[PDB]
Design an enzyme around this catalytic site. Structure first.
Site, PDB file in Angstrom:
ATOM      1  N   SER A   1       0.796  -1.221   0.000  1.00 29.27           N
ATOM      2  CA  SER A   1       0.000   0.000   0.000  1.00 29.27           C
ATOM      3  C   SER A   1       0.839   1.287   0.000  1.00 29.27           C
ATOM      4  O   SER A   1       0.290   2.383  -0.190  1.00 29.27           O
ATOM      5  CB  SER A   1      -0.977   0.005   1.173  1.00 29.27           C
ATOM      6  OG  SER A   1      -1.906  -1.082   1.082  1.00 29.27           O
TER       7      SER A   1
ATOM      8  N   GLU B   1      -4.391  -7.595  -5.618  1.00 29.57           N
ATOM      9  CA  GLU B   1      -3.360  -8.570  -6.009  1.00 29.57           C
ATOM     10  C   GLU B   1      -1.925  -8.068  -5.838  1.00 29.57           C
ATOM     11  O   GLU B   1      -1.000  -8.881  -5.711  1.00 29.57           O
ATOM     12  CB  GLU B   1      -3.575  -9.033  -7.453  1.00 29.57           C
ATOM     13  CG  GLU B   1      -4.849  -9.840  -7.676  1.00 29.57           C
ATOM     14  CD  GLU B   1      -6.104  -8.973  -7.724  1.00 29.57           C
ATOM     15  OE1 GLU B   1      -6.013  -7.790  -8.136  1.00 29.57           O
ATOM     16  OE2 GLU B   1      -7.189  -9.481  -7.349  1.00 29.57           O
TER      17      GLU B   1
HETATM   18  C1  LIG Z   1      -1.553  -2.273   1.717  1.00 31.21           C
HETATM   19  O1  LIG Z   1      -0.438  -2.465   2.167  1.00 31.21           O
HETATM   20  C2  LIG Z   1      -2.696  -3.262   1.915  1.00 31.21           C
HETATM   21  C3  LIG Z   1      -2.426  -4.389   2.313  1.00 31.21           C
HETATM   22  N1  LIG Z   1      -3.339  -5.258   3.041  1.00 31.21           N
HETATM   23  C4  LIG Z   1      -4.701  -5.346   2.494  1.00 31.21           C
HETATM   24  C5  LIG Z   1      -4.713  -5.907   1.094  1.00 31.21           C
HETATM   25  O2  LIG Z   1      -4.183  -7.016   0.823  1.00 31.21           O
HETATM   26  O3  LIG Z   1      -5.279  -5.252   0.194  1.00 31.21           O
HETATM   27  C6  LIG Z   1      -5.587  -6.170   3.444  1.00 31.21           C
HETATM   28  C7  LIG Z   1      -7.024  -6.190   2.923  1.00 31.21           C
HETATM   29  C8  LIG Z   1      -5.520  -5.589   4.848  1.00 31.21           C
HETATM   30  O4  LIG Z   1      -6.031  -4.258   4.831  1.00 31.21           O
HETATM   31  C9  LIG Z   1      -5.220  -3.116   5.211  1.00 31.21           C
HETATM   32  O5  LIG Z   1      -4.022  -3.239   5.439  1.00 31.21           O
HETATM   33  C10 LIG Z   1      -5.918  -1.775   5.317  1.00 31.21           C
HETATM   34  C11 LIG Z   1      -5.043  -0.593   4.893  1.00 31.21           C
HETATM   35  C12 LIG Z   1      -4.559  -0.630   3.447  1.00 31.21           C
HETATM   36  C13 LIG Z   1      -3.531   0.482   3.268  1.00 31.21           C
HETATM   37  O6  LIG Z   1      -2.625   0.611   4.117  1.00 31.21           O
HETATM   38  O7  LIG Z   1      -3.586   1.274   2.286  1.00 31.21           O
HETATM   39  S1  LIG Z   1      -4.975  -7.890   3.578  1.00 31.21           S
HETATM   40  O8  LIG Z   1      -5.896  -8.653   4.488  1.00 31.21           O
HETATM   41  O9  LIG Z   1      -3.612  -7.854   4.218  1.00 31.21           O
END
Ligand SMILES: *C(=O)/C=C/N[C@@H](C(=O)O)[C@](C)(COC(=O)CCCC(=O)O)S(=O)O
Ligand SMILES: OC[C@H]1O[C@H](O[C@H]2[C@H](O)[C@@H](O)[C@H](OCCCCCCC3CCCCC3)O[C@@H]2CO)[C@H](O)[C@@H](O)[C@@H]1O
Length: 265
Positions: free
Chosen positions: A45, A143
């Site tokens: 992210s 993804e």
């Molecule tokens: C960005 O790093 C997001 C990673 N994790 C998400 C994904 O795989 O799209 C999750 C859905 C967890 O959600 C979050 O981390 C919320 C914040 C996203 C952000 O920091 O922009 S997955 O379950 O890890």
């Protein structure tokens, strides 16, 4: 706490994973600490800051407006859309979408913005235009944080990401207002910002965007410094560790603690 590099090494030993780190003066680009700085790590992210840099460049060129309202459909939503899921009836402005992506971690907001800059390929082309020849986005949310071992997709290096953030925030490639906006979005992070403040000593500035991925992937791009000033860019990425989320978070915080205790280098 031990010295920054010593702490970074301890973190790899404890996590059984790779850490990549750069600490850089924001004003000049002076590199203070570099560890695996030319090695690839999944951006996760953290790419959302660069994404909104591309959006702002379009605004500056008169090809976009932060005010412009985008209307979207429920079928456009991907996993984790705390803000965008609330606006199926009324839409969100481009600026609201950047705020949601960067400050609330909204994934659908990021995808909507990604479409406006020409997708992963368009964002990668923007990166090449600002002289980042390494960072690449290949996939959409969600993804893009799969973090497969040895997969070059959706990666940056600590050195490239730090340099690119410095370019967006300070190099006058973006207008004064746009530079100020990108900075304020990072200041306003609600995902990790308040938590980080709660554990920072008085007097330390923080602005940030964090990320998480598979196989232990975890990261942060941050502005940090004493006397309430954004003195340095700090980029830390972790990959290929089986450790708990808590332990990955603690190890990154520990690198931060070493920087704080041994700031004057
Ligand atoms: C960005 O790093 C997001 C990673 N994790 C998400 C994904 O795989 O799209 C999750 C859905 C967890 O959600 C979050 O981390 C919320 C914040 C996203 C952000 O920091 O922009 S997955 O379950 O890890
Ligand atoms: O002597 C320096 C300081 O040492 C301690 O501060 C601790 C603090 O109590 C702890 O909570 C933090 O944890 C580190 C928290 C870091 C949070 C994430 C950091 C981000 C920032 C940018 C990228 C890296 C990660 O470390 C510092 C330094 O030891 C004392 O509590 C404080 O009074 C004193 O001013």
């Amino acid at each position: 706490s031990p010295q920054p590099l010593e702490q970074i090494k301890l973190s790899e030993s404890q996590l059984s994973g790779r850490v990549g780190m750069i600490e850089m003066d924001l004003a000049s680009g002076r590199t203070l600490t570099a560890w695996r700085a030319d090695e690839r790590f999944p951006m996760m992210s953290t790419f959302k800051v660069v994404l909104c840099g591309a959006v702002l460049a379009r605004v500056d060129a008169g090809d976009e407006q932060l005010e412009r309202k985008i209307h979207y459909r429920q079928q456009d939503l991907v996993d984790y859309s705390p803000v965008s899921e609330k606006h199926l009836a009324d839409g969100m402005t481009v600026g609201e979408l950047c705020a949601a992506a960067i400050t609330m971690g909204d994934n659908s907001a990021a995808n909507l913005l990604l479409a406006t800059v020409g997708g992963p390929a368009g964002l990668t082309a923007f990166l090449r235009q600002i002289g980042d020849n390494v960072t690449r986005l290949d996939r959409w949310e969600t993804e893009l944080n799969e973090a497969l071992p040895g997969d070059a997709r959706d990666t940056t290096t600590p050195a490239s990401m730090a340099a690119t953030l410095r370019k967006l925030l300070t190099s006058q490639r973006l207008s004064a207002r746009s530079q100020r906006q990108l900075l304020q979005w990072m200041v306003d992070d609600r995902v990790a910002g308040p938590l980080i403040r709660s554990v920072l000593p008085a007097g330390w500035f923080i602005a940030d965007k964090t990320g998480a991925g598979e196989r232990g992937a975890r990261g942060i791009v941050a502005l940090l410094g004493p006397n309430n000033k954004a003195e340095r860019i700090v980029v830390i990425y972790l990959r290929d560790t089986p450790a708990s989320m808590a332990e990955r978070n603690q190890q990154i915080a520990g690198i931060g603690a070493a920087l704080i205790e041994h700031w004057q280098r």
